[PDB]
Amino acid sequence: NLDIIGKRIEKIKQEHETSWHYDQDHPYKTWAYHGSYETKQTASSMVNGVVRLLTKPWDIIPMVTQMAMTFKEKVDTRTQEPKEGTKKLMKITAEWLWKELGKKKTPRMCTREEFTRKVRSNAALGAIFNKWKSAREAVEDSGFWELVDKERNLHLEGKCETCVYNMMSRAIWYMWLGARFLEFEALGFLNEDHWFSRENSLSGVEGEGLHKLGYILRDVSKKEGGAMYADDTAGWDTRITLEDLKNEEMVTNHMEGEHKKLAEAIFKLTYQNKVVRVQRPTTVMDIISRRDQRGSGQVVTYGLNTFTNMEAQLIRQMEGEGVFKSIQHLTVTEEIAVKNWLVRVGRERLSRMAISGDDCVVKPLDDRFASALTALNDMGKVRKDIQQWEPSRGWNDWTQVPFCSHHFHELIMKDGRVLVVPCRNQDELIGRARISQGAGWSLRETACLGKSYAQMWSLMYFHRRDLRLAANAICSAVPSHWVPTSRTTATHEWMTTEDMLTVWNRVWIQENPWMEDKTPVESWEEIPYLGKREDQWCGSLIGLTSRATWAKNIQTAINQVRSLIGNEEYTDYMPSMKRFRR
Ligand SMILES: [Zn+2]
Ligand SMILES: [Zn+2]
Numbered sequence: 001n002l003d004i005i006g007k008r009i010e011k012i013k014q015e016h017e018t019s020w021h022y023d024q025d026h027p028y029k030t031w032a033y034h035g036s037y038e039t040k041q042t043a044s045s046m047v048n049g050v051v052r053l054l055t056k057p058w059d060i061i062p063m064v065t066q067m068a069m070t071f072k073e074k075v076d077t078r079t080q081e082p083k084e085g086t087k088k089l090m091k092i093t094a095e096w097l098w099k100e101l102g103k104k105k106t107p108r109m110c111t112r113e114e115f116t117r118k119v120r121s122n123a124a125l126g127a128i129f130n131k132w133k134s135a136r137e138a139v140e141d142s143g144f145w146e147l148v149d150k151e152r153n154l155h156l157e158g159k160c161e162t163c164v165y166n167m168m169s170r171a172i173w174y175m176w177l178g179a180r181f182l183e184f185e186a187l188g189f190l191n192e193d194h195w196f197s198r199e200n201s202l203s204g205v206e207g208e209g210l211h212k213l214g215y216i217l218r219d220v221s222k223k224e225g226g227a228m229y230a231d232d233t234a235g236w237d238t239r240i241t242l243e244d245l246k247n248e249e250m251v252t253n254h255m256e257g258e259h260k261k262l263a264e265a266i267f268k269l270t271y272q273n274k275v276v277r278v279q280r281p282t283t284v285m286d287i288i289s290r291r292d293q294r295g296s297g298q299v300v301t302y303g304l305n306t307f308t309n310m311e312a313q314l315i316r317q318m319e320g321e322g323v324f325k326s327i328q329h330l331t332v333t334e335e336i337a338v339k340n341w342l343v344r345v346g347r348e349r350l351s352r353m354a355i356s357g358d359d360c361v362v363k364p365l366d367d368r369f370a371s372a373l374t375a376l377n378d379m380g381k382v383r384k385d386i387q388q389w390e391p392s393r394g395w396n397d398w399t400q401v402p403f404c405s406h407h408f409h410e411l412i413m414k415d416g417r418v419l420v421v422p423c424r425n426q427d428e429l430i431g432r433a434r435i436s437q438g439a440g441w442s443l444r445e446t447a448c449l450g451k452s453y454a455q456m457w458s459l460m461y462f463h464r465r466d467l468r469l470a471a472n473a474i475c476s477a478v479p480s481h482w483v484p485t486s487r488t489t490a491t492h493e494w495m496t497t498e499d500m501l502t503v504w505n506r507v508w509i510q511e512n513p514w515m516e517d518k519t520p521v522e523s524w525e526e527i528p529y530l531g532k533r534e535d536q537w538c539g540s541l542i543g544l545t546s547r548a549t550w551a552k553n554i555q556t557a558i559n560q561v562r563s564l565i566g567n568e569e570y571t572d573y574m575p576s577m578k579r580f581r582r
Contacts, residue, residue: 004268005289008164008275009034012287023284030078031276031288040283043438044070050450051433054473054557057546058430067431074235075171079292079380086378087243088330089318089338093311094247096342100350101195101307102254109259110188112145115181124488125184126298127177128166135177148178155182155265156258163269165276165295169235173276173295183270183297186263190251190303202350203310205404206303209491210460211507214408214420215514216354217361217398223352226367227394228401234384236305236358237294241380245272245292247311248304271296305357309381310350313362314342316376317349320369327374354403361403370394411463413528417517419508421463423530426539429461430470437487445485447565450474452484455494459503463530465542472573473554475500477561479568501576524576551579 002009013020016037026033047068058064082090118125119135132138151162163182165173175183189195196204198216205213221228233239249267252260274295278286294301318324323341324334354361362369371391382388395401399408405428411419433453436446454474457467484495493507494500504527505520521527529535532542541547550557554574562570574580 001273004160004273005275007159007161009287009289011161012037012164012277016285023286025282026286027280028076028286028288030076031290034287034289036280036284036286039279039285041279045435045437046439046441047434048436048446048450050447050477050561051453051474053561054450054477055430055434055470056557057541057544057550058427058434060546061427061430063425063427064431064434068435071169071235072171074169074238075167075293077235077238079239079241082241082243082378082380083327083329085324085327085330086375088335089315089324089327089375090243090247090311090379092335092338093314093342094250096339096346097307097311097314098250098254100347101201102251104200105189105193105195107251107255107259107263108189108193109186109262110184110192112181114188114192115139115184118184119177122487122489124298125177125180126172126174127180128174138177144178148181151178152182152262155269156261158265158268160265160269163275165274167276167278171237172298179270180297182262183266183300186259186266187296187300187303191299196303196306201306201310202347203313203353203355204306205354205356206306207491209493210404210406210422211491211512213354213404213406214422215512217401217403217408218410218420220352220354220361220363221398223363225352225363225365226369227363227396228398229362229364229369229392229394230360230401230403231386231392232384233358233381236309236381237301239380239382240292240294240308242272242292244308244379248307302357306355309355309358309360310353312376312379312381313353313355313360314346314349315379316372317352317362317364317369319372319375320364320366322368327378356404359404361401367394409463409530409534411528411530414526415519417515419463419528420514422460423464423538426464426466428539429457429464429467433457443565444482447478447561448482448485451478451482452486452494454478455484455496455500458500459494459507462504462524462527464538464540465529465532465535466540466547468524468529469551469554469577472576473558476571476573477558477565479565480571481569525578554580
């Protein structure tokens with residue numbers, strides 16, 4: 001409590017000494033409330049015209065058009081301390097899982113240099129603008145790093161001054177770039193050295209890519225066992241207990257020297273004790289604090305979510321297999337039984353899951369898992385849109401399992417070779433491509449964002465007839481040599497000016513471990529589509545009059561965009577498709 005946070009508070013209080021007030025109509029119950037001061041400010045989504053002009057049939061689909069217009073009463077909730085038996089299961093599993101993850105990995109500090117290259121090539125690090133404009137500026141200024149060093153030495157001293165969260169089913173807690181650096185220094189290794197790669201963690205998929213997830217779900221399916229379960233948790237970040245944060249901090253037991261001390265500091269001082277500033281239109285800045293829930297960098301968050309989720313799902317598999325009887329109290333024999341489970345079969349049970357942060361697919365030993373709910377509910381990982389004690393409905397077919405907002409089709413090429421391709425509702429794909437994040441975009445930048453989406457569609461979604469044609473139209477309407485961009489950069493192999501058929505061959509054939517025959521594909525017509533009815537089920541406008549007119553007259557849509565952009569060097573990609581090939 002207040003000895004660890006007070007300094008952070010007293011510093012904010014003093015810089016707004018002409019405003020401080022302990023407001024009495026403060027809405028916080030679950031958050032500790034310390035005071036307020038005067039502010040007045042707010043970034044809305046804009047339409048990408050290049051994409052919208054080349055997807056005219058979708059101008060009248062409400063699912064598309066609505067995406068472009070525009071619970072914080074769930075962040076003010078409170079999870080209960082689990083039973084002692086749950087806490088024992090979680091401590092033992094956490095200990096065993098960090099050992100497994102750390103067997104072929106060395107924890108290590110990340111560097112000012114690594115961090116500098118990160119900012120200088122636009123990764124979303126969720127920092128704030130103040131004393132410098134962008135993050136790009138502060139990184140080259142030696143004064144910044146002096147501020148970092150002050151705080152850094154403070155952290156080694158066991159205190160904190162400037163590591164304060166700014167609030168904004170999503171809620172994004174920004175810190176000043178300096179505190180983001182110190183978080184990255186201590187915990188960046190988890191991401192940077194692929195601790196949750198599938199090879200290293202068995203359950204994880206970090207850096208796998210949308211073209212591998214399908215093959216991974218299919219490999220899980222090949223194991224003997226029950227249905228595939230894919231239960232979403234209701235507001236996962238808000239359900240992270242103090243006990244979860246303490247089990248995550250056990251990664252520091254694998255560390256040493258400066259590192260161990262810095263990592264420990266981040267966990268003690270930013271994670272297990274938070275200070276947050278929130279806007280309130282009643283517009284004042286409220287300085288509230290709490291011990292529990294998730295609030296890290298989007299990227300460390302990803303890794304710790306994956307870690308804790310892996311942990312919960314192993315424990316739920318234990319409950320399914322009757323490794324323990326009650327969560328109220330774990331007997332001494334029930335400890336050794338859990339320990340012996342983890343030693344004997346824990347790696348086999350990890351290979352039964354695909355886990356991406358708060359998202360999971362589990363194929364347990366059998367369907368007893370479906371109603372194994374006591375540990376899962378008592379850890380506070382309460383399932384979304386299902387009664388708390390109602391059993392999980394599993395999937396019989398790996399091609400229906402939802403994972404990372406996708407489903408996966410099995411698709412056989414005219415030469416017999418098998419593609420496992422990602423898919424989702426086409427209204428979702430087209431509606432996202434039509435949105436741009438930020439203001440002050442030139443025509444050229446807007447066109448280059450359009451091209452990023454088109455090249456993604458050609459790489460991941462080539463099997464959808466509307467997306468292949470729209471992607472060819474966008475890549476025909478944007479100058480051939482202009483480089484794809486994106487303002488918050490999975491594997492992203494569409495971010496290139498290389499020939500897209502050459503990237504397709506590298507990703508789907510050459511580098512694809514599930515493809516035994518490495519015969520390159522020579523043109524786009526070798527590359528198959530979903531069945532026509534499958535395509536319509538997944539949202540295709542194939543068969544509609546609007547779409548046939550769009551398809552027939554596409555060269556006129558391409559020319560409209562060409563005319564707006566101007567006299568540049570353009571390539572016609574529409575002859576890559578049979579119907580436009582004369
Ligand atoms: Zn700090
Ligand atoms: Zn589909």
